[PDB]
Symmetry: C5
Subunit: 205 residues, 5 copies
């Protein structure tokens, strides 16, 4: 009943959504996956692919946990993302702002596990010259934290999902591979991880 | 009137718009209706339909009720939605953010029944290839709660309504059907209800 | 000025811009009129009219009144509309959000009379098929409150004027009318008024 | 700096950016000019001209004054326009919202003099029929206060400039004149001044 | 973590994001670099270039420093830019607002050194008529403080890296240069410094 009201109150107490919830030396592990829903368009002149996808981002926030016996019935809560820390993931080769298609809410259970599952439309730089060939065009969707390094934010992949690709598109989805990389940059002391989704596709016919 | 001014004070006191107003072992029943108003356009290359529709959502928020004898004359109030909990219904196959055309206000009576009735323009993914044939094209417009499952938010369909369809469109509205599904996901033990409106349309002539 | 600064400080006390300023039984009377400045475009395929127009809206807000001899020289003040109650008028057949072209300020005098005079661009659903005939096409621009009925918000017209219509347009005005009606809807026990501006126009040539 | 910081806390005190800083029998004088940077497009069908320009606006706000002696080093401060009163200048014949291209900051010196110099892109209603003729097309960009009459806000022209018109435009800028006018209305005892910029241009050929 | 949360509380105190962090007579030195990623389009009719680029900006804010011994583990934090001072760099000849592609977060180390690295899409006025020639077209990208002169904000370049220019563009990069300038405007006594990036490029094939 009102326990949920009571819980939101305590959870917001002394919480800062700008601050990554690392706990003494241990990085926040962030599990990450992309599912391709639709390739909306290609621009062969300007080298751009327009896509709709669903992101899966999940991690543990130790500040957002609670004893279930103090709030009977409350096993999970639905929370607007502006009120909690969320990973600052960025598409490295995007040429447009992401358009979030779904309500900006995350699910949080009693042990502090968070799930933010946004569906998103965004345009990306890509060489789409081969879209008209048997081998198709290959586009890399590269994602990573904009400002958090490996030892703060440990980005890891879950298995991706093409089962949600719409069948009636004018683009045939040949394949989708994903890989986690990590590199030191000529800029910073700590290394940064990234996850890249490579999608190959062609125009039917 | 003073009584409204006083009533607004009390309704915001101890009120959290992020908390679904469930009440002990009972979900919030959300009644849901869609009236198709106009099919704005069809993108036959990218498989997209652009529609304008009127949504009708209503539910009882038990934290928003008041004794009429205490606030005499005040039988209902008009409140901005940003100050109210609202169902987090997502348009599952939307490829654009919804453009809300009407004022973002809801009606609330003294037993906490809320009505929110936005008019919306939105683009959806759809196989429109059959639009210039007699059988026409069929688009599904699928909605459901993004983060609340069946035991928290009970989505209930109301009557199919095509009376608002403008008569001078270049698209003949053949039929609109609806179905309420309660589907499980490979993730959660609890199902998530969704309401699907199926509209069949074809180019006049 | 000092007196204007002192007046704001008084007027803002307890002011709630979400609460309609009715006074026991008495509705708030709202005067409304529209002047067409320009027909920007007609979309013959999708049945849409793009127009620029000037609304005149005025009403009395009784919490916004003051003794002029307590604030000598202060006869009217300029107030951002975000700070005051404004009628929740909607364009019933708009297919886009209204784009406001002018500063969002209302004039308020010492007897509580408020004037808000925005210039607005907005697109409407309209059968424009006969735009190239001598009879021309007719568009109805219908306006009314979205959540207030007759006994709370009494919409009235002030008379029209077409003298602001730009004369170098490619469209010629053939007829203009604006009437106030009062109709019932399936929802409510109470009637809701509206003002409708009916413009007939055609391509010159 | 340390004193700049302290000057802000003082200036914010009792300051109301909604109240025009008039005195008894002393309008706020607003100096105003326009520099045309480029004519982006002309729309001969819909009668629209698209322009990028630089406005200069300066006025004195006696509530922003300070003693340099009390704040040594601080001759001027850089302030967000949202923090202070600014003239509600409207473009009378604009068919679009002004796109502000520059940081929304004003310069304020110790005597209270505020300078605001935004770069703007905006579209205006205009008869561009003559754009291909030798006579050229003539457009009038008319600006004035939306809600303040002469006795509150005294609009004045400053000597304009076209040294900043880009020389590789496809449009040849022929001539630009300016004039301050003061006109009455049937509504108001007091007149409302405006500054109008007349520009004559033609396609280069 | 808990140290970091404590750290945020402290930096936020008395901190005014509107006040440039000058220290007695010392300007804030701001290092500035542009990395061209993609030329998206050219408009040979409207003389416009559309570009995606990566800006590197860095400066020290002495109000943002702490002792790592007081806050063990915390070497650097990531902070929303809206919550701290940032240079008011303007794109002088831009004809559109900047679309910021990346999270609006800056990095700050314990000595108060701030790094802000937004990726940005923006359109610029430019004579692109050389694009189809051996010499190609030359476009200038002129940036500088809008409201701070040389003695307040000291704009310095860093090397303009073009290792990020995508290879599959239809435009070939011929050369990029960078120059600092100081200009005196008929207004003030101090100079305003601008950094200009000059890019030469031509259509491939
Ligand atoms: C605020 O708005 C809400 C939503 O419209 C109002 O809610 C409705 O109240 C109805 C009347 O109280 C209520 O009706 C029924 O409850 C049962 C149906 O599930 C049914 O048993 C009742 O029948 C009653 O039985 C007799 C015998 O026939 C009837 O003749 C009497 O009318 C009895 O009331 C009612 O039909 C309905 O369920 C409810 N709707 C929702 C969605 O909750 C609410 O009253 C408004 N508040 C106020 C104070 O006006
Ligand atoms: C809260 O959510 C987490 C994350 O889903 C739940 O954890 C998983 O449970 C499965 C099934 O036993 C385990 O195999 C995994 O090891 C868990 N994942 C992680 C990341 O820890 C967890 O069960 C939930 N906690 C509560 C209190 O119910
Ligand atoms: C603040 O700025 C105003 C505007 O520039 C200054 O007023 C000018 O002063 C100069 C001489 O210093 C005169 O020649 C101009 O006629 C003035 N202009 C206007 C519009 O009045 C003013 O001096 C500045 N204040 C301080 C403290 O220097
Ligand atoms: C905070 O960041 C700045 C910027 O990287 C660091 O400053 C530099 O130190 C290196 C060598 O130690 C020099 O090559 C740079 O020229 C320095 N930048 C200058 C001159 O400001 C600074 O050391 C960092 N602080 C901490 C605590 O690590
Ligand atoms: C404030 O403005 C209102 C409207 O102009 C003034 O109005 C009322 O009186 C006028 C004639 O005396 C009428 O022309 C108005 O239509 C009428 N309006 C209403 C709704 O009552 C009013 O006098 C002004 N108040 C003061 C003190 O000047
Ligand atoms: C942002 N950058 C690292 C930070 C950094 O380089 C940097 C840090 C500090 C100073 C100078 C540069 C952090 C991890 C992401 C990486 C991204 C890549 O650079 C990049 C830049 C522009 C477009 C696409 C990709
Ligand atoms: C978001 N998802 C359910 C939650 C969930 O799946 C989920 C929860 C937790 C972990 C992993 C997945 C809640 C109800 C909606 C459903 C939506 C569907 O996925 C989906 C995603 C993208 C496009 C179309 C459909
Ligand atoms: C919004 N509606 C009335 C309110 C109401 O219906 C309503 C009220 C309470 C409960 C359920 C519905 C108020 C007056 C306007 C009317 C609008 C028209 O239907 C309409 C709907 C959709 C597009 C165009 C026009
Ligand atoms: C806003 N109006 C004056 C006020 C006023 O008229 C008015 C005031 C009160 C009642 C009725 C009308 C103030 C000075 C500007 C002027 C603008 C012009 O109307 C106008 C309207 C629409 C498009 C272009 C121009
Ligand atoms: C704004 N201006 C300087 C100040 C100033 O000129 C000025 C100040 C006060 C009064 C009159 C003029 C400050 C530094 C930037 C410079 C910009 C340039 O004008 C400009 C304006 C519009 C487009 C391109 C360039
Ligand atoms: C003198 C003056 C200038 C500008 C505004 C006002 N009043 C207000 O902004 N209010 C907000 C709510 C009621 C009053 C006064």
């Amino acid at each position: 009943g009102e326990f949920q009201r009571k819980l939101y109150k305590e959870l917001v107490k002394n919480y800062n959504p700008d601050v990554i919830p690392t706990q003494r030396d241990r990085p926040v592990t962030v599990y990450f996956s992309l599912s391709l829903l639709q390739i909306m368009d290609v621009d062969e002149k300007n080298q751009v692919v327009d896509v709709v996808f669903w992101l899966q981002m999940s991690w543990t926030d130790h500040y957002l946990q609670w004893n279930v016996s103090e709030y009977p019935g409350v096993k999970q809560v639905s929370v607007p993302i502006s009120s909690l820390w969320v990973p600052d993931l960025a598409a490295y080769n995007a040429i447009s702002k992401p358009e979030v298609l779904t309500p900006q809410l995350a699910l949080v259970n009693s042990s502090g596990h968070v799930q933010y599952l946004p569906s998103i439309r965004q345009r990306f730089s890509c060489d789409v010259s081969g879209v008209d060939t048997e081998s198709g065009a290959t586009c890399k969707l590269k994602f990573g934290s904009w400002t958090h390094h490996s030892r703060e934010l440990d980005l890891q992949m879950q298995e991706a999902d093409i089962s949600g690709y719409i069948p009636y598109s004018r683009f045939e989805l040949v394949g989708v591979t994903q890989k986690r990389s990590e590199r030191f940059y000529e800029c910073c002391k700590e290394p940064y991880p990234d996850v890249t989704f490579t999608v190959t596709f062609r125009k039917k016919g």
